[PDB]
Amino acid sequence: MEVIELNKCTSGQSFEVILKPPSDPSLEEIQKKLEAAEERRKYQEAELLKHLAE
Amino acid sequence: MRECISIHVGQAGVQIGNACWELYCLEHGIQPDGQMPSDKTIGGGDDSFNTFFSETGAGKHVPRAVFVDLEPTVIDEVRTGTYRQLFHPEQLITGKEDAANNYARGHYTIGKEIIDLVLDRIRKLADQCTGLQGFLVFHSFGGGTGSGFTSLLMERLSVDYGKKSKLEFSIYPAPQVSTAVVEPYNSILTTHTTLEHSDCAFMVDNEAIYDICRRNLDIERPTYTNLNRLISQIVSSITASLRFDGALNVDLTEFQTNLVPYPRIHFPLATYAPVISAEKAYHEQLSVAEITNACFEPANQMVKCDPRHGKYMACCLLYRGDVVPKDVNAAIATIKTKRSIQFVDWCPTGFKVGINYQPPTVVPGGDLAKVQRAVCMLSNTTAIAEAWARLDHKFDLMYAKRAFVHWYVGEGMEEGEFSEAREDMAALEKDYEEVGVD
Amino acid sequence: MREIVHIQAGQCGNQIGAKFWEVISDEHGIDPTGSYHGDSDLQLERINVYYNEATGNKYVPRAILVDLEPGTMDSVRSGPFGQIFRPDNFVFGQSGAGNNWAKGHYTEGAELVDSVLDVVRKESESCDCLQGFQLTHSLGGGTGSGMGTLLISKIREEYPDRIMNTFSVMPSPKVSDTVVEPYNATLSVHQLVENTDETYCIDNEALYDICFRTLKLTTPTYGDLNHLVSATMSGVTTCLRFPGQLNADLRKLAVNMVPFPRLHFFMPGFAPLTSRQYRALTVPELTQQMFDSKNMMAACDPRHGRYLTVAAIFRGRMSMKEVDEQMLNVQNKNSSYFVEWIPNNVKTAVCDIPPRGLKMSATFIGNSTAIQELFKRISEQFTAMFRRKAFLHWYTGEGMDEMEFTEAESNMNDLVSEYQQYQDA
Amino acid sequence: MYTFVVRDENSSVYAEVSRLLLATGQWKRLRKDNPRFNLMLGERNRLPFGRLGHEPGLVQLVNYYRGADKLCRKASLVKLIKTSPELSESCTWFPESYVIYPTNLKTDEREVFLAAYNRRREGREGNVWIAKSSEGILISSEASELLDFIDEQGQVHVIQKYLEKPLLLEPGHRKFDIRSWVLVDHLYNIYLYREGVLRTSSEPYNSANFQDKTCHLTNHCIQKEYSKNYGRYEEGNEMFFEEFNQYLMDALNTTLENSILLQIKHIIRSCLMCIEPAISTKHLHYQSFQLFGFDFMVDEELKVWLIEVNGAPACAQKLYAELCQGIVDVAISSVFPLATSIFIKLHHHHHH
Ligand SMILES: Nc1nc2c(ncn2[C@@H]2O[C@H](COP(=O)(O)OP(=O)(O)OP(=O)(O)O)[C@@H](O)[C@H]2O)c(=O)[nH]1
Ligand SMILES: Nc1ncnc2c1ncn2[C@@H]1O[C@H](COP(=O)(O)OP(=O)(O)CP(=O)(O)O)[C@@H](O)[C@H]1O
Ligand SMILES: Nc1nc2c(ncn2[C@@H]2O[C@H](COP(=O)(O)OP(=O)(O)O)[C@@H](O)[C@H]2O)c(=O)[nH]1
Ligand SMILES: COc1cc([C@@H]2CC(c3ccccc3)=NN2C(N)=S)cc(OC)c1OC
Ligand SMILES: [Ca+2]
Ligand SMILES: [Ca+2]
Ligand SMILES: [Ca+2]
Ligand SMILES: [Mg+2]
Ligand SMILES: [Mg+2]
Ligand SMILES: [Mg+2]
């Protein structure tokens, strides 16, 4: 079990102990996504308003 | 010195940010009005605390933080609160109406109208940075804002700051304190859209924090205030190494390289000890061995699960208080012989240790006692995939009947995003099973 | 999501609506003057959801009063809180509607509806964030059912992205005014299935039975029924009017209660049942009673169906650990009656302020498939007449075709099939 | 009123446990997929332990121990015995065994197996081994026959020293194994059922012909299948403990307790205390119990050897009623109380 890369300083210390060794979409693709969903919303709203007009 | 910006989204994120920044100020001796007698460099700074605070000519120390909610009531209590003076008004951003617990409403419908404003305020903060490391993003899985707006924020952050690291602190949904029946939907949705945009995420399961609060603080019915003061202690021990002199995890890149060998499996389990009631009349202080040993009981984890039946890819121990390396190695030696700690074959069995000598700070009048030493262990164990299985089951149960999906479709989402997200989660569960089981 | 616009239409709409404003005005500490004289500030923290603030720090109910007959609304103005209502919000014709859905929806009502919508628009234009509308009405008369559903579609046209919530009193032969009530109700349920997000189904059969069997009143008045109705209404709107760990609004209520859009007809429950009581009730007693069929305001046996979702509110000072424990116990002990494919479908809230007259109380909002029992009852009464086209002339004289009737019956029978679908899923 | 769910319907034992549970009048059964249970009679494979213990207000309990397959599948049993200091290679109640994977799967111990096989050739000791997989058995003095066999199948097998001088009951000159039923409760109390069974063979043991199965393989099925005299001496090829005790007294001047049972209690406790830290549910959010079936051989010196551990055992049919009642007494109502124990508790605290 060996201790390594030990570093000390006034506020603390760090080290490593080893027990055993080993054996993105664009801005405009995003705006296209948001805009497609807005379109689908507006279409649903229009289908509703058409039925109410009937 | 390289700056980090903290971003708190929705109710859970904002209230936890409150908790953390109260704690940070206590720890760095910054007063509510923003002053720091302790800082002798007036108006300026190259120090480790300047990673989280900027300075003004009047000596005010200001969080590198943005609060974002789609509805005002919660950020309003920041604006009127005890830390009123600390935050610049442009750092607190509110909408008119929230996302109604609806991922697609927060992502698509209301996200679209506020994303550019939020990115502009975030860049106002980034322009004040000589060398920005990246972001700490706080949010709930279950909220509509929390899930949906955060995922849109994460995509845009990858676009505007692609070299930066993004870390998450995510609240995982628990029915004892949850507010909505669709939180599984939201969490899968947001995990799926956020996965390749997060470098490392610490999940906190409200169930685990709740039971810690009942069992070890003797609180009959924990509030968000209880939960958040405890969660903020944990977050503080995770960030202390960015805010203090040291040599372990000194920048956000080090969290990924120490805790995340595989980029998809980037959800380290956090275990924290000791949690002791302030109203405990007589308490015998616990030793290095006792609290390192507590690191391996599930009852102390931020997520209930059983690492005995998984494999480790990485383990870090952050101690705060009266701790020296010799005692840590002694305790580790003895724990290894008494416990099932199996690392994956292609990783060294071992621990990275960091010690800071000031013991945890506790808010006056809080529920937590002051203690002489404490430890937060961060271990990337495959056992955490249990939580995904939980979530996924709940999701499968509802989505089979398409229950509630109509509320999302009516926001412009397509039913197909549900099964895309679920299939990504299926992938994820399979990756964990490959790495961690024979 | 702050301001709600309340509309009461017709005799029943306005009488329950007035009792509602009485009850919650008392709970919030406002007197008939419109002046606040309370002792806690939980009272004023969200009082903008239901009240506007006038000059002199007066509070004015965001409430519109609608009838085709002047009678009941002059009695409203006569009554206890009559002068708290803004006088421009009284909108009324002279004809009356003769218990005739057609008169309310197609002929007399058309004539009056644009005025009401003018007042509605005036009230919503002053709202920072309007969440939507709650309507009080019965379904068995003519103004409430016919004209109220006319209003509902006009409002959906002008405010298609706001929430429409109704308290809808269903007719019972046990309390009935006329024989055509099943006709009026079936036409209205056709409207409500299409055009509301959340309907509290207040069944006059259940109110009569509670008044008779449980409260031991042998000849119940509308006053006795409306006592129960204003108790229920105060309960179900608690988490909208007060701040808590859970602060609700009309849309989150729809999101968490309604898994499928048409299945939005809620069965309310109340405990303790009270009539115009010194022993305090224990949390186990509240929890047992509120779930008892004898405390349901919709005459349905909840063991004949399954709970899709449940939301309970406990009012008073008591141990929320005990309430959590009790709710969890009733779920885990009768778990067959809660669908397995909606996890954690029971959510519980507490508020410290109790209703006037009680130290402790509990209100229950159930989305049960047992609600189908109500719609089949109406459906039976409908067919019994319609198969002989009886009384149809009152309606065909106002322009309606039989086709509209058979269409509405069909849609309601479909609603019932949907409920049975999910009761065996 | 406690609640429970049944997810293994081919369990003889837990079928009867289901029945007496209802007969209490204080237990109600739920549907397979209902999460609001106190008690799970789980399935044999891929039991979802990750979903247990997350129901507020439900103490949850399951009839299996996550991890216990380390003991109950032969390759893992071999691995566990020779890798754990508590047991070690020098473990004296386990036959030397080695794990061997097939040709086209390729870790494995093939070469170290023959390392000993050759000093067994040379040794002039019995060099007959058995090959096993977790149907599919071969007993041979020739190693290469063993591995020929092994790799024309696709499974990982284990090669284990066959016990060439077993104890043979007379009349018959015939083999047997002993099966012991062990219940481990949520407290990791280890309970041995007072009644075991000898699964006998009806055929005289014959050393020369190692490829007629029935005089060499003791399990119930093969005796009810390929054996000429099934049921001849004992009903069901099953000798219980009263008899075997009397026989040992009459023929060997010993008792079952002294000659065999001390060794059996020792092996059961060593095996379970070994894996206890890996499987204990002492501070977990759910609880386990489990019923195991331990199988032992007795050689002519009256030494006990462990051959296998069974994670989902059936009972002998006369004992079903008694054992199952005890399961409810000790495993289930200890956790969920209702309105002369048949078990020996296995414990020993020698000081040193
Ligand atoms: N630990 C903790 N969990 C919280 C807190 N606030 C909310 N939650 C949990 O987060 C989930 C609800 O999400 P919220 O963050 O409140 O929702 P939001 O992001 O504000 O989205 P909307 O208000 O729907 O627009 C539930 O699981 C809550 O229990 C908090 O302050 N601390
Ligand atoms: N080393 C060995 N020496 C002698 N006989 C052995 C032996 N290993 C196994 N046997 C014999 O093989 C028989 C069955 O072997 P084994 O117990 O491994 O298979 P199995 O898993 O089908 C039993 P069960 O069905 O009860 O689980 C035993 O009863 C025993 O007679
Ligand atoms: N619970 C209750 N039901 C009423 C009341 N008044 C009328 N109803 C019912 O409402 C139906 C008649 O409708 P009503 O409101 O008088 O008709 P409208 O004025 O023309 O809309 C009948 O089923 C009555 O039973 C009341 O005050 N309380
Ligand atoms: C907690 O009980 C209440 C719950 C609400 C909606 C319903 C919902 C809910 C959550 C989970 C399961 C089932 C329902 N939670 N809800 C919201 N968070 S808005 C509304 C309430 O009143 C309007 C209310 O009290 C009566
Ligand atoms: Ca400085
Ligand atoms: Ca990236
Ligand atoms: Ca006219
Ligand atoms: Mg919110
Ligand atoms: Mg009338
Ligand atoms: Mg006009």
DSSP string, C282-305: PHHHHHHHHTSGGGBSS---GGGS
| B233, B226 contact by CB (below 8 A) | no
| C49, C2 contact by CB (below 8 A) | yes
CATH 3.40.309.10 given to domain D68-71+167-346: no
The CATH architecture to which D2-62 belongs is 3-Layer(aba) Sandwich (3.40)
Residue D83 three-state SS: helix
Burial class from Cβ neighbours inside 10 Å (0-12, 13-18, 19+) for residue C308 reads buried
Tokens representing residue A36 in the block: 């497609």
Contact B340 D53 (CB under 8 A): no
Touching chains B and A? (3+ Cβ pairs < 8 A): yes
Burial class from Cβ neighbours inside 10 Å (0-12, 13-18, 19+) for residue C125 reads exposed
Q: How far is the C-alpha of C12 from the C-alpha of C16, rounded, in Å?
A: 6
Phi-psi region of C106 (alpha: psi -120 to 50; beta: other; left: phi over 0): alpha
Q: Which helix (H) or strand (E) holds C256?
A: helix C250-257
D161 Cβ below 6 A of ligand 2? yes
Residue D2 three-state SS: strand
DSSP 8-class letter at B109: I
Q: Ligand 1 pocket test: which of B118, B179, B203 has the largest number of ligand atoms within 8 Å of its C-beta?
A: B179
Q: Which helix (H) or strand (E) holds D252?
A: helix D241-252
Q: Which CATH class is domain C374-424?
A: mainly alpha
Tokens representing residue A48 in the block: 């509703």
* Chain position carrying tokens 């299409």: C194
| D301, D253 contact by CB (below 8 A) | no
Looking at chain D, after which residues does the C atom sit over 2.5 Å from the next written N, breaking the chain? 106, 134, 339
Tokens representing residue A24 in the block: 């993105």
Touching chains B and D? (3+ Cβ pairs < 8 A): yes
- Contacting residues of C for B179, CB less than 8 Å apart: 246, 252, 347
Count the helices and strands in chain A (H runs, E runs).
1, 2
State yes or no: B95 annotated in a binding site: no
DSSP 8-class letter at C232: H
Within a 13 Å sphere around the CA of C354, how many CA atoms are in the beta-carbon half? 16
Tokens representing residue C166 in the block: 């109704």
Closest by CA to C121, choosing from C75, C74, C154, is C154
Tokens representing residue A6 in the block: 């030990």
Q: Which domains does chain B have, with CATH numbers?
A: 3-259 (3.40.50.1440), 269-386 (3.30.1330.20)
Report which residue type is found at C330: V
Burial class from Cβ neighbours inside 10 Å (0-12, 13-18, 19+) for residue D209 reads exposed
Q: Which one of the listed residues B27, B254, B290, B429 is annotated catalytic?
A: B254
Report yes or no: B308 at the D interface, CB cutoff 8 Å: yes
Q: Does residue D171 have a cis bond before it (omega within 30 degrees)?
A: yes
Q: Which helix (H) or strand (E) holds B172?
A: strand B165-172
Tokens representing residue D133 in the block: 């997989």
Report which residue type is found at B177: V
CA D210, D238, D193: angle at the middle one, nearest 5? 115
> At the topology level of CATH, where does C267-373 sit?
60s Ribosomal Protein L30; Chain: A; (3.30.1330)
Q: Which atom of ligand 4 is nearest to the CA of C312?
A: 2
Q: Please say whether the dihedral angle defined by the alpha carbons of residues B419, B420, B423 and B428, taken in this order, is positive or negative.
A: negative
| Binding residue positions of C | 11-12, 97-99, 138, 141-144, 175-177, 181, 204, 222, 226
Q: Does residue B274 have a cis bond before it (omega within 30 degrees)?
A: yes
DSSP string, B370-408: P-SEEEEEEEEEGGGHHHHHHHHHHHHHHHHTTTTHHHH
Q: Does residue C272 have a cis bond before it (omega within 30 degrees)?
A: yes
Alpha-carbon dihedral of residues B97, B99, B104, B107, nearest 10 degrees? 70
Provide the 10 A C-beta neighbour count for residue B404.
Answer: 22
Distance, CA D15 to ligand 2 centroid (Å)?
26
- The total number of residues shown for chain A amounts to 54
DSSP string, D268-296: HHHHHHHHHHHH--TTSSSEE-EEEEEEE
Report yes or no: A18 at the C interface, CB cutoff 8 Å: no
| Strand spans (E) along chain A | 2-9, 12-20
Q: Which ligand is nearest to the CA of B263?
A: 6
Q: How far is the C-alpha of C316 from the C-alpha of C318, rounded, in Å?
A: 6
DSSP 8-class letter at B299: G
Of D54, D67, D283, the CB nearest to B207: D54
| Residue B386 C-alpha, separation from nearest chain D C-alpha, in angstroms | 5
Q: How far is the C-alpha of D58 from the C-alpha of B209, rounded, in Å?
A: 18
DSSP string, D10-66: T-HHHHHHHHHHHHTSSEEE--TT-S--SEEE--SSS--GGGTT-STT---EESS-T
- Contacting residues of D for B338, CB less than 8 Å apart: 277
Contact B109 A24 (CB under 8 A): no
What are the backbone dihedrals phi and psi of residue D75, each rounded to the nearest 5 degrees, phi first?
Answer: -60, -40
Pick from B157, B159, B332 the residue to mutate for testing the A interface (most A CBs within 10 Å): B159
Residue D180 three-state SS: strand
Provide the 10 A C-beta neighbour count for residue D133.
Answer: 16
Report yes or no: C160 at the D interface, CB cutoff 8 Å: no
| D192, D182 contact by CB (below 8 A) | yes
Q: Please say whether the dihedral angle defined by the alpha carbons of residues D242, D247, D249 and D254, taken in this order, is positive or negative.
A: negative
Q: Which residue is closest to B107 within chain A, CA to CA?
A: A34
Burial class from Cβ neighbours inside 10 Å (0-12, 13-18, 19+) for residue C350 reads buried
- Angle formed by the axes of helices D12-23 and D320-327, nearest 10°: 60
Alpha-carbon dihedral of residues C145, C149, C150, C151, nearest 10 degrees? 110
Q: How far is the C-alpha of D267 from the C-alpha of D271, rounded, in Å?
A: 6
Tokens representing residue C338 in the block: 């809660």
What's the Cα-to-Cα distance from C4 to each of C116, C130, C203, rounded to whole Å? 16, 6, 24
Q: Please say whether the dihedral angle defined by the alpha carbons of residues D167, D171, D174 and D175, taken in this order, is positive or negative.
A: negative
Q: How far is the C-alpha of C155 from the C-alpha of C132, rounded, in Å?
A: 10
Q: How far is the C-alpha of B184 from the C-alpha of C377, rounded, in Å?
A: 37
Alpha-carbon dihedral of residues C254, C259, C262, C265, nearest 10 degrees? -60
Beta-sheet pairing, D138-140 with D157-161: unpaired
* B254 has catalytic annotation: yes
- Contacting residues of D for C340, CB less than 8 Å apart: 31, 33-35
Q: Which residue is closest to A52 within chain C, CA to CA?
A: C157
Contact C332 D58 (CB under 8 A): yes
| D327, D20 contact by CB (below 8 A) | no
| D16, D314 contact by CB (below 8 A) | no
DSSP 8-class letter at D169: B
Distance, CA B347 to ligand 6 centroid (Å)?
24
Q: How far is the C-alpha of B332 from the C-alpha of B326, rounded, in Å?
A: 10
| D2, D18 contact by CB (below 8 A) | no
> What is the stated resolution of the deposited model, in angstroms?
2.8
D295 Cβ below 6 A of ligand 2? yes
What's the Cα-to-Cα distance from C160 to each of B396, C14, C145, C408, rounded to whole Å? 32, 25, 21, 23
Q: Please say whether the dihedral angle defined by the alpha carbons of residues C41, C47, C49 and C53, taken in this order, is positive or negative.
A: negative
| Strand spans (E) along C139-182 | 163-170
Pick from B98, B401, B402, B408 the residue to mutate for testing the C interface (most C CBs within 10 Å): B401
The full 3-state SS of B231-298, as one line of letters, equals HHHHHHHHHHHHHCCCCCCCCHHHHHHHHCCCCCCCCCEEEEECCCECCCCCCCCCCHHHHHHHCCCH
Within a 13 Å sphere around the CA of D8, how many CA atoms are in the beta-carbon half? 23
Q: How far is the C-alpha of D322 from the C-alpha of B53, rounded, in Å?
A: 71
| B245, B326 contact by CB (below 8 A) | no
Q: Which residue is closest to D33 within chain C, CA to CA?
A: C340
Pick from B151, B327, B352 the residue to mutate for testing the A interface (most A CBs within 10 Å): B352
Q: How far is the C-alpha of B387 from the C-alpha of B384, rounded, in Å?
A: 6
All CATH 3.30.1330.20 domain ranges of chain C, comma separated, are 267-373
Residues of chain C numbered 315-344 and touching chain D (CB < 8 Å): 324-325, 328-329, 331-333, 335-336, 340, 343
Longest distance between any two alpha carbons in chain D, whole Å: 68
Burial class from Cβ neighbours inside 10 Å (0-12, 13-18, 19+) for residue B50 reads buried
Q: Which residue is closest to A18 within chain B, CA to CA?
A: B350
Residues with CB in 5 Å of ion ligand 6: B 158
Q: Which residues contact residue A50 at a Cβ distance below 8 angstroms, ignoring those fewer than 6 apart?
A: none
Count the helices and strands in chain B (H runs, E runs).
15, 12
Q: Which residues contact residue D318 at a Cβ distance below 8 angstroms, ignoring those fewer than 6 apart?
A: D240
Across the A/B interface, how many CB contacts are shorter than 8 Å?
108
Q: Which CATH class is domain C3-266?
A: alpha beta
Q: Which helix (H) or strand (E) holds D98?
A: strand D97-100
Beta-sheet pairing, C63-67 with C90-92: parallel
Q: Please say whether the dihedral angle defined by the alpha carbons of residues C321, C322, C326 and C327, taken in this order, is positive or negative.
A: negative
- Contacting residues of D for B299, CB less than 8 Å apart: 283, 285
Q: How far is the C-alpha of C53 from the C-alpha of C59, rounded, in Å?
A: 5
Across the A/C interface, how many CB contacts are shorter than 8 Å?
9
Residue B220 three-state SS: coil
Report yes or no: A4 at the B interface, CB cutoff 8 Å: no
